[PDB]
Write a protein that binds this DNA or RNA. Structure first.
Ligand SMILES: [Mg+2]
Ligand SMILES: [Mg+2]
Ligand SMILES: [Mg+2]
Ligand SMILES: [Mg+2]
Ligand SMILES: [Mg+2]
Ligand SMILES: [Mg+2]
Ligand SMILES: [Mg+2]
Ligand SMILES: [Mg+2]
Ligand SMILES: [Mg+2]
Ligand SMILES: [Mg+2]
Ligand SMILES: [Mg+2]
Ligand SMILES: [Mg+2]
Ligand SMILES: [Mg+2]
Ligand SMILES: [Mg+2]
Ligand SMILES: [Mg+2]
Ligand SMILES: [Mg+2]
Ligand SMILES: [Mg+2]
Ligand SMILES: [Mg+2]
Ligand SMILES: [Mg+2]
Ligand SMILES: [Mg+2]
Ligand SMILES: [Mg+2]
Ligand SMILES: [Mg+2]
Ligand SMILES: [Mg+2]
Ligand SMILES: [Mg+2]
Ligand SMILES: [Mg+2]
Ligand SMILES: [Mg+2]
Ligand SMILES: [Mg+2]
Ligand SMILES: [Mg+2]
Ligand SMILES: [Mg+2]
Ligand SMILES: [Mg+2]
Ligand SMILES: [Mg+2]
Ligand SMILES: [Mg+2]
Lengths: 115, 50, 149, 77, 50
RNA sequence: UUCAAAUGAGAACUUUGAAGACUGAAGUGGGGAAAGGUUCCACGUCAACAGCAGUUGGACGUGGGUUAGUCGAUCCUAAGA
RNA sequence: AUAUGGAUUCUUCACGGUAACGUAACUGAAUGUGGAGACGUCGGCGCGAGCCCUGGGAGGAGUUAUCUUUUCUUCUUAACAGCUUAUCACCCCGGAAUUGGUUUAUCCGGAGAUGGGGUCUUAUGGCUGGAAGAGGCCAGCACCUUUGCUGGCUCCGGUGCGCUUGUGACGGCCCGUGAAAAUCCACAGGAAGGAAUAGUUUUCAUGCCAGGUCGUACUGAUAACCGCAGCAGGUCUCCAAGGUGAACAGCCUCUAGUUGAUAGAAUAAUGUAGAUAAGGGAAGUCGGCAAAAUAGAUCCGUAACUUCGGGAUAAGGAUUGGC
RNA sequence: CGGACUACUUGCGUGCCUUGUUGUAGACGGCCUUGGUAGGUCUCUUGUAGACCGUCGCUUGCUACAAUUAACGAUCAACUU
């Protein structure tokens, strides 16, 4: 009954924050006030803790916190800020994730030696 | 986007010099057959007038 | 992020060429010098093999074409690297005998095929059939070198 | 396809003079509970059957590989 | 019938080799009265009767 | 059944995309036995045929394609000849 | 075809178990027996497989106005080989009424039950080898060319009058008792040969060589077959998801497939295919023709007559949702 | 005097990976062998550390408690009325 394992989850936000369309402080605050634990919001009584260093958002949990739930909450935040259709949430290796841009083709850029 | 536009630039080749605005240099082949393919309808006639 | 790339499939000719400034003349002069040296080399091989005939077997037409082309590529390999896009042989080495006016450059794997295909004919084409020259022949040597067009 | 237990049987089988090929396959898996570990399978090709010797303890695998005959065309992975 | 005999397959092979229009060099002959193949066969038009 | 583009001299009917529907696993799905015999597939291509049309086709012209010691026949006997 | 290894023997042609029988082998001619091939249909019951349903985790996709730790999808394992695994059946000990054991279904026992200990067929399942190296799901790079590469993950469970199918042990039915031959094996027999420098073994293991002829594409039908046709006709069979529901009924959906059948505009009469109608209720007609009315399930109740088995869902009545 | 051309040929800076070798790492039956940890329990924030229980532990000699012997009490999963 002493299986109090402390799972860790890492999300890399560095590419959209460096390109200037994301905000990891607001993303972390969204996580603190929307993570559900035992069916209720704001019940984060030392069960999970999420921290933000400006490039990597880290969740450390000892409750029911699979990576599907983190993907679900991040997609909900991107929809709320209208960044769905532009940013996706992908897994690099196990429990390390990152925000990526969808594929975009460039413009023409051939008017009077513009490129 | 300016970086990607600078990367996808142009470069032209001698094939685009000498073969741009050019058709194929081979015949029509009105039955649409290959080079070593038989044409039993038109083998015996060897000029287009006939 | 990095955006994308494409294939684009269409283009046309470009500008500012065939004006004959110093770089164009340098390319023309380099191609001319390589061609002159190659002609001198193949002439010396024909003279060494047929007009001295020291002790051993003589060279044939496919071997002469192969050695001349490899000498051309070996000399051209150290000129105008990573500054022009295209180099190499413009006209391959052709050695013609009397009636043949153009287009004789047989490969090195076709000597037995030439013998088998012409077994039955007479001796009027025997220099081109076997590859060895005999006295009384006009031998035409043609080659060509290009640098960036 | 046959499974061999005796290592002396494996050596007298790989010295049969009608074999030509043997492969060593390394695959990494998990124990009963805790840890990963390497496992080496030795597959010698006969004329009618393929013989496999499975070594779990990776210490003596290197000794078998060193003491294998010098004529077979041994294939890694 | 996808499991046939050699006799049936032999007659099918002859009927396949007979299915051609007229060669065009035959029309150019001196006093030629053959203008078309009057014994042409088609699979949906008329049956072979084994 | 509808919209746009492409092709083409020409598009209610061809191709792709966007939509709306139907068969509903005792199917308008996936295989075979009798029978047919090249209809399969590619390239070219519209005089006749497809009871309107046609740039399309099971049409017209030229080719390609069916690989067995183990699947069948071949062997055995039945009613019978 | 053949060569080795092993096995056998100077007690010439093997040993071990009380036994049922066991094993890597363990001579066996003529002749004669035995088995397999080799078999109906229906009923319930047991087990196996595939499908269906379902819980954690690791990936991918969608929805997000508000809500949804959410909805969908991927997580697989062939023939063959080794070890093991069973209802039935059999062997040994023992001796049974206060009769016991026992199936859903009543059969078995001094011709030896219950009980204790064992042997066997391998249907079928498990674990290994085959085999992760395959296949699947994702993330990337050069993304220059009709050219080339590298990474991860592929893991653990649950349930059942479920569905389809294979199989076992039983049971019912008959004035019906539900093919044959090729082929293969075994037994009885004791001919003949054989061990000492050896014979038998290719029924034990390994090694060597060969396997001819003909068919094989596609449709199998509202367009590939037959009806004179690209004809609403005819023509043998296998696989078979979710919901509702007794249900392979009808109705809606997933996988796969199709969107074919001359079109455009209007809305006269008469038609074809359907519908509703006040008051009356067969007055209509040769004739209640046609339509209406009834209808599933639960509970109560049910006459004459009868070949006693039926008639019978007779007739008649009270009900049915959601939480 | 000559360079249009890289090639025409140091070191030694900054780094990539195989690293060859230790530094680091030392990831684990080794039984060198005492009161038990998921043992029954308790001060000990659990559990350890300590003990108590005098001996737990699937188990067994050791004989015993409605012995779950009149079974009243604690242990997981379908849809029928
Ligand atoms: Mg006839
Ligand atoms: Mg239409
Ligand atoms: Mg319908
Ligand atoms: Mg429908
Ligand atoms: Mg069915
Ligand atoms: Mg076709
Ligand atoms: Mg075509
Ligand atoms: Mg027409
Ligand atoms: Mg027309
Ligand atoms: Mg055709
Ligand atoms: Mg023995
Ligand atoms: Mg049955
Ligand atoms: Mg199979
Ligand atoms: Mg098989
Ligand atoms: Mg059936
Ligand atoms: Mg037998
Ligand atoms: Mg085939
Ligand atoms: Mg086929
Ligand atoms: Mg087919
Ligand atoms: Mg069918
Ligand atoms: Mg069909
Ligand atoms: Mg029909
Ligand atoms: Mg017909
Ligand atoms: Mg019809
Ligand atoms: Mg139901
Ligand atoms: Mg239904
Ligand atoms: Mg009325
Ligand atoms: Mg009346
Ligand atoms: Mg009346
Ligand atoms: Mg009247
Ligand atoms: Mg009526
Ligand atoms: Mg009555």
């Amino acid at each position: 009954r002493k299986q109090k394992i402390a799972k860790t989850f890492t999300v890399d936000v560095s590419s959209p924050t460096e390109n200037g369309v994301f905000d990891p402080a607001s993303y972390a605050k969204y996580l603190i006030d929307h993570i559900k634990v035992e069916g209720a919001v704001g019940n984060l009584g030392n069960a999970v803790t999420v921290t933000e260093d400006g490039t990597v958002v880290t969740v450390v949990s000892t409750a029911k916190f699979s990576g599907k739930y983190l993907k679900y909450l991040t997609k909900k935040y991107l929809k709320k800020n209208q960044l769905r259709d532009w940013i996706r949430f992908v897994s690099t290796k196990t429990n390390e994730y990152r925000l990526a841009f969808y594929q975009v083709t460039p413009e023409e850029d051939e008017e009077e030696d513009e490129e | 986007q300016n970086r990607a536009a600078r990367k996808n630039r142009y470069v032209e080749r001698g094939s685009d010099v000498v073969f741009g605005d050019q058709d194929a240099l081979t015949a029509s082949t009105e039955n649409g057959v290959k080079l070593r393919q038989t044409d039993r309808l038109l083998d015996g006639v060897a000029d287009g007038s006939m | 992020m990095a955006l994308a790339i494409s294939h684009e499939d269409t283009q046309i000719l470009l500008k500012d060429k065939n004006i004959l400034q110093e770089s164009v003349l340098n390319k023309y002069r380099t191609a001319g010098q390589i061609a002159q040296t190659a002609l001198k080399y193949v002439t010396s091989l024909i003279n060494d093999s047929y007009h001295s005939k020291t002790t051993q077997r003589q060279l044939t037409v496919p071997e002469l074409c192969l050695l001349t082309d490899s000498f051309i590529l070996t000399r051209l390999e150290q000129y105008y690297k990573n500054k022009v896009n295209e180099r190499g042989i413009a006209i391959p080495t052709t050695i013609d005998i009397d009636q043949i006016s153009g287009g004789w450059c047989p490969e090195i794997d076709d000597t037995q095929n030439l013998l088998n295909w012409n077994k039955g004919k007479d001796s009027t084409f025997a220099s081109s059939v076997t590859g060895t020259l005999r006295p009384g022949d006009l031998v035409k040597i043609t080659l060509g070198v290009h640098i960036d067009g | 396809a046959r499974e061999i237990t005796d290592i002396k049987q494996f050596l007298e089988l790989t010295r049969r003079a009608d074999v030509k090929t043997a492969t060593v396959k390394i695959n990494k898996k998990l124990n009963k509970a805790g840890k990963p570990f390497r496992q080496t399978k030795f597959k010698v090709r006969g004329s009618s059957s393929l013989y496999t010797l499975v070594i779990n303890d990776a210490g003596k695998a290197k000794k078998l590989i060193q003491s294998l005959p010098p004529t077979l065309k041994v294939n890694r992975l | 019938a996808a499991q046939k005999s050699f006799r049936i397959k032999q007659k099918m092979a002859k009927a396949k080799k007979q299915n051609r229009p007229l060669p065009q060099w035959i029309r150019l002959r001196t006093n030629n009265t053959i203008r078309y193949n009057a014994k042409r066969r088609n699979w949906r038009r008329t049956k072979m009767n084994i």
